[PDB]
Design a protein around this nucleic acid. Structure first.
Ligand SMILES: [Mg+2]
Ligand SMILES: [Mg+2]
Ligand SMILES: [Mg+2]
Ligand SMILES: [Mg+2]
Ligand SMILES: [Mg+2]
Ligand SMILES: [Mg+2]
Ligand SMILES: [Mg+2]
Ligand SMILES: [Mg+2]
Ligand SMILES: [Mg+2]
Ligand SMILES: [Mg+2]
Ligand SMILES: [Mg+2]
Ligand SMILES: [Mg+2]
Ligand SMILES: [Mg+2]
Ligand SMILES: [Mg+2]
Ligand SMILES: [Mg+2]
Ligand SMILES: [Mg+2]
Ligand SMILES: [Mg+2]
Ligand SMILES: [Mg+2]
Ligand SMILES: [Mg+2]
Ligand SMILES: [Mg+2]
Ligand SMILES: [Mg+2]
Ligand SMILES: [Mg+2]
Ligand SMILES: [Mg+2]
Ligand SMILES: [Mg+2]
Ligand SMILES: [Mg+2]
Ligand SMILES: [Mg+2]
Ligand SMILES: [Mg+2]
Ligand SMILES: [Mg+2]
Ligand SMILES: [Mg+2]
Ligand SMILES: [Mg+2]
Lengths: 130, 144, 134, 53, 185
RNA sequence: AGGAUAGUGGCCUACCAUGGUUUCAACGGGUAACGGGGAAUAAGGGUUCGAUUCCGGAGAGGGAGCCUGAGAAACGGCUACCACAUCCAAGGAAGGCAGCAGGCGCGCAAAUUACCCAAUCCUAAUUCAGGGAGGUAGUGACAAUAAAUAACGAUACAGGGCCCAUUCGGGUCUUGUAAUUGGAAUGAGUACAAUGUAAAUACCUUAACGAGGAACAAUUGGAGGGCAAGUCUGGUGCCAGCAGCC
């Protein structure tokens, strides 16, 4: 659809069901206090193909799946759990760092709001675009 | 006789005079003319989300001193640029360039207020969070 | 042998539905929320019917407790009870058990799939088997 | 320049409150105001006031 | 769609909010009758003036008027029926004189303290709320019940709840239970 | 006069006439206009609104056209064109949520791709089948009803009505301060059980569990005036900032 992102990961414990309350723990969370912790639920779990995804209601641990219902709450990567003090997972650094860079201004003067949401939506799409 | 028609068959001129003389009522005219929509940077909306173009404080007006801490705001719904007060002690470190921001009216039913020349709106939320919850150490701006 | 003292009011006989219908008032002080199955095993001993021909439902119990109210009715024969009572109540007493057929989404979902097919598709299995591929 | 946003909300030396016994948030609050308004409310002083000095 | 389940509102707020005299007069009754809201007074004064100014309209009706009599001695019917008028007054006019004060006095919260039974109204409500007192075989726990003087004496405690037999109370039983060990055995 | 319609009628056609509306507002223009039963505020009189639980009307992306049928100018019917736009092996094919869900967009502004025909009812060849009509639950501080967040003591402290009395008061009635202290009462929860229901969830009934302050910890704005409440304490010093108005 227009710019709204399944979330794509693999689960290592428990299960995941369509319509399930979960805590998302972003890259900065620690089990102690206010951190990257949003507590909303999952609209649909869905397993993916050559971009057609097949909604499934329950998924065990050890598989890769998609997750539509989030990405208002994720920015690039995250680890969501069900336990109060389940720590995060190591931050997963790659061998390329964001180095080539240009300035972006909007051609017309008034599309600017469309440009600032785009950067947010762009940050989401690629794992290390800044 | 007291200067208006008083016959029993008078009720046409009576009802019609009242209609013309209603135009001398200021807010009746504001309602019929639709200056709600043609003029006035809102559409008649209670509030309007906008975009912070530049932080800018503007002169006070006499009798008082004290710079006034506003922001020129581009409105999302019509790209009109307007300025609005950011009220409180501090409350300008809380805004950066290009923060989304929700502007409310000011109380005087349009047509600017108090210390300040020509500014009719005030900030309430900036990047989704109320100034109050930010001005007190209640809440915190989202992660840039 | 406790003071459970159940009334029964507004008893009027319904031949056309082969039963007597009536409201029940179980005045049960020093006791809370007496069950429905227990509200028959010696209840049929009061209207002299046999024990699987009765039915009762309703039953929200007064604020403050000590008495529940609801509606019941007894049948002129258990054979007609199995014919007249709703096909969901006999489930509640085990006198029927309704079918496992899949969720109504699947029922509708397959209802629609079978509009895609005109006749029997018995010629269709002959279609696809020779193909796939060449 | 901008320069003076947090000019006082910062420079006030921020002090803590007093972790004092809880007041009776409910009906009895109306009760103890009825009491510290009419009955032995030894808050009278001339005609009346409601703040110390 | 559906059919609208109607609702009314039960109070009415004063027009000037900071009348000095009115502000104290209200707290005097909250103290007198152990109430918690100002709404609890606003509720009656609105309801009264609802009933009151809906009886002003009943006498510009010039008299012997058929609707005046039927809704007359069948309104007054309801107002000593709830003990806010006398049987020594069966004749229609002092109804407009009636103050808010008379209504509070037949709240069940206030009637408790006045039938002995509480020794204080703040003590009355707190016990009205805790599945103590009943009127018939019927527990009530709403500090505004408006006894009818047809049930002004059926008001007793509850046969559930200690104070009426059969149960001794969670706080007590759990306390005296721990004296098993130290009673000797 | 005729044609056409189910039928009256400039409805249409041939011929003929020059009439028809209007300052008692015709005609035009605007409506951020579906109409109404109603909604809000109201001493009275009125002022403002009515997309929206009922009734009537109009539409099914926009126009027009038509089939079948008693009934459609139908759109979860077909056909053409206009605007979008899906799939393709490039040959072709297929489109219509202002139905229920869900999503995009728009925005200040509005919910779950859940369960079910048990109820209300509707349809059918029909007692059974079907119904996102409708009902159940989820979301839900739009609006409304009721009304928890404490009660009562003791001790120590604080003041004052009193037979026989010269009274530190001898005795008095009630009454407030402080982490000084006591035993009762309870649901918010949590939970066997039944009840509840189509099956469930909460409601009500309820075994057992569930209260002393650092809690089962109430908020929102205010304290010069209007306008209820500070000539308190510290900070700043026409600065920060407050201020509907002054
Ligand atoms: Mg997209
Ligand atoms: Mg004339
Ligand atoms: Mg004009
Ligand atoms: Mg004029
Ligand atoms: Mg002029
Ligand atoms: Mg001035
Ligand atoms: Mg938003
Ligand atoms: Mg009880
Ligand atoms: Mg003709
Ligand atoms: Mg209009
Ligand atoms: Mg319109
Ligand atoms: Mg209208
Ligand atoms: Mg309208
Ligand atoms: Mg309407
Ligand atoms: Mg509209
Ligand atoms: Mg139509
Ligand atoms: Mg059509
Ligand atoms: Mg459709
Ligand atoms: Mg249709
Ligand atoms: Mg549409
Ligand atoms: Mg948005
Ligand atoms: Mg809303
Ligand atoms: Mg929305
Ligand atoms: Mg049905
Ligand atoms: Mg059926
Ligand atoms: Mg509410
Ligand atoms: Mg609380
Ligand atoms: Mg202050
Ligand atoms: Mg004052
Ligand atoms: Mg202030």
């Amino acid at each position: 659809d227009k710019g709204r992102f399944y979330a794509f990961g693999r689960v290592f414990a428990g299960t995941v069901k369509s319509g399930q309350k979960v805590r998302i723990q972003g890259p900065n969370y620690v089990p102690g206090k206010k951190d990257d912790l949003f507590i909303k639920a999952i609209q649909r779990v869905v397993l993916m193909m050559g971009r057609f995804v097949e909604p499934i209601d329950d998924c065990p641990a050890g598989n890769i799946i998609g997750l539509v219902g989030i990405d208002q709450f994720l920015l690039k990567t995250g680890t969501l759990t069900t336990s109060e003090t389940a720590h995060n997972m190591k931050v997963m650094k790659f061998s390329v760092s964001p180095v080539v860079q240009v300035a972006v201004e909007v051609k017309n003067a008034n599309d600017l709001p469309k440009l600032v949401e785009g950067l947010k939506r762009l940050s989401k799409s690629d794992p290390c675009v800044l | 006789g007291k200067g208006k028609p008083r016959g029993l068959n008078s009720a046409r001129k009576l009802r019609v005079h009242r209609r013309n003389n209603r135009w001398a009522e200021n807010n009746y005219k504001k309602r019929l003319l639709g200056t709600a929509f043609k003029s006035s940077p809102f559409g008649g909306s209670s509030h309007a989300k906008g975009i912070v173009l530049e932080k800018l404080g503007i002169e006070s007006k006499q009798p008082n001193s004290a710079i006034r801490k506003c922001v020129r705001v581009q409105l999302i719904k019509n790209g009109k640029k307007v300025t609005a007060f950011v009220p409180n002690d501090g409350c300008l470190n809380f805004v950066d360039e290009n923060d989304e921001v929700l502007l409310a009216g000011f109380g005087r039913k349009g047509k600017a207020k108090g210390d300040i020349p020509g500014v009719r709106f005030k900030v309430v939320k900036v990047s989704g969070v109320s100034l109050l919850a930010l001005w007190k150490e209640k809440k915190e701006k989202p992660r840039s | 042998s406790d003071a459970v003292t159940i009334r029964t009011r507004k008893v009027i006989s319904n031949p056309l539905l082969a039963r007597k219908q009536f409201v029940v008032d179980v005045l049960h002080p020093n006791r809370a929320n007496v069950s429905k199955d227990e509200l028959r095993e010696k209840l049929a001993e009061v209207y002299k019917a046999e024990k699987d021909a009765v039915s009762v439902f309703g039953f929200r119990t007064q604020f403050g407790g000590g008495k529940s109210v609801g509606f019941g009715l007894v049948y002129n024969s258990v054979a007609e009870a199995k014919k007249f009572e709703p096909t969901y109540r006999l489930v509640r007493y085990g006198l029927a058990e309704k079918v496992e057929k899949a969720s109504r989404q699947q029922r509708k979902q397959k209802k629609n799939r079978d509009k895609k097919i005109f006749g029997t598709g018995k010629r269709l299995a002959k279609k696809v088997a020779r193909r796939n591929a060449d | 320049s901008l320069a003076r946003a947090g000019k006082v909300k910062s420079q006030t030396p921020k002090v803590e409150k007093t972790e004092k016994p809880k007041k009776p948030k409910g009906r009895a609050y109306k009760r103890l105001l009825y009491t510290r308004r009419f009955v032995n409310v030894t808050l009278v002083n001339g005609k009346r006031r409601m703040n110390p000095g | 769609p559906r059919a609208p389940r109607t609702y009314s509102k039960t109070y009415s707020t004063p027009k000037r909010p900071y009348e000095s005299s009115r502000l104290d007069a209200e707290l005097k009754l909250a103290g007198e009758f152990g109430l918690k809201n100002k709404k609890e007074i606003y509720r009656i004064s609105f309801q009264l003036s609802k009933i009151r100014r809906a009886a002003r309209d009943l006498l510009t009706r010039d008299e012997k008027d058929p609707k005046r009599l039927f809704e007359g001695n069948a309104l007054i019917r309801r107002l000593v029926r709830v003990g806010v008028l006398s049987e020594d007054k069966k004749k229609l006019d002092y109804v407009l004189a009636l103050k808010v004060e008379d209504f509070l006095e037949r709240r069940l919260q206030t009637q408790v303290y006045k039938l002995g039974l509480a020794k204080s109204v703040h003590h009355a409500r707190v016990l009205i709320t805790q599945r103590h007192i009943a009127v018939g075989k019927q527990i009530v726990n709403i500090p505004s019940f408006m006894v009818r003087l047809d049930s002004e004496k059926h008001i007793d405690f509850a046969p559930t709840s200690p104070f009426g037999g059969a149960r001794p109370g969670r706080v007590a039983r759990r306390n005296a239970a721990r004296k098993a060990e130290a009673s000797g055995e």
